[PDB]
Amino acid sequence: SNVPHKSSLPEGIRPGTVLRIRGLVPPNASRFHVNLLCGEEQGSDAALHFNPRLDTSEVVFNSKEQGSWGREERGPGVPFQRGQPFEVLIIASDDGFKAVVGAAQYHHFRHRLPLARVRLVEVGGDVQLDSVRIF
Amino acid sequence: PHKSSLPEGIRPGTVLRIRGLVPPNASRFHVNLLCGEEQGSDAALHFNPRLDTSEVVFNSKEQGSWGREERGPGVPFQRGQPFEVLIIASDDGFKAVVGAAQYHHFRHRLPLARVRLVEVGGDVQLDSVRIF
C-alpha cells in the first residue's frame, strides 16, 4: 500500500545516479514494474521498463519510444520471490543501466534512449514498497 | 586491511557497497581509493569515520601530501552498531551514502581513471565489499 510511487527528476539524471528500491513482493503477487519515464504526461517515452514477472518467472527489460515498445530483453531467471523482500539498484552509466538485485549484478540494459531525457521514475504493480531513493 | 583490486579502473556509475559492524572500542576506520597497489600510492578518496573524535574526515593524497580535509555533518556511525556505506562515482565527484540518506559529496581531486584499488582498514569488522 504505497503504490503507485512517483519520484520526479526535473533536473534529470546522469552517469552515476543510483536508484535504490526496497520493498516486499506480496504473497499472491503477479508482477510489478519500475519505469524511467521522460515526462509526467501519460504515455510518455520510457528510457527503461524493469518488469519482474513472478507468474511467468521472468524479468523483462524494454523501452518505449513514441507510443511504441522496442524489443524485449530478458535477464537470467527471476531474483524475486513471493513473500520475500528485495533490494534493487538501478545504476546509470555512460553506456547503459546496471540492474543489481540482492548484492549481485543481474543485467546490463544497453542504452536505447538518451539518458538526459529521463525526468521521472515510477514504480507500480504487485509490490509493497519500503523506500524509493535516488542518489 | 581488506583489498579489492581494480585493474579495470572505475567509471561514472560504479557503486561501492560496504556492509559491516563498528566494534565496541573502535576509534576510527577508513576506506581508501588508491591509484596503485604499491604502498604510499596516491589516494583519490580517503573516507575516515572517526568515532573517537566524533566526526568523519574526507580527503586526498597526492605525491606524499594530503590535501585539504573535508568533514561531513556529524557522524552517522556508532560503536557496536552495523552500517551500510555507498560510495558512488559520478562525473563530478564521489557521493557517500550512509544508511538511508546521502551523507557527503566529495568532489573529484585526482582523475577517477587512476583509481586501481579499494582498501578498508582500521577498527572495522567487514561483512561484505562489492563493486558494481
Curated annotation (Swiss-Prot), chain A:
Its main location: cytoplasm. A beta-D-galactoside binds at W69, G70, R71, E72, E73, R74, G75. GO terms for biological process: apoptotic process; heterophilic cell-cell adhesion via plasma membrane cell adhesion molecules. InterPro entries: ConA-like_dom_sf, Galectin-like, Galectin_CRD. Transmembrane segments: none annotated. GO terms for molecular function: carbohydrate binding. It is found in: Cytoplasm; Nucleus; Secreted. Induction: By p53/TP53. One of its GO terms (cellular component) is cytoplasm. SMART domains: Gal-bind_lectin, GLECT. It comes from the Eukaryota. PANTHER family: GALECTIN (PTHR11346), GALECTIN-7 (PTHR11346:SF107). Monomer. Could be involved in cell-cell and/or cell-matrix interactions necessary for normal growth control. Pro-apoptotic protein that functions intracellularly upstream of JNK activation and cytochrome c release. This is Galectin-7. It comes from Homo sapiens (Human). The gene is LGALS7.
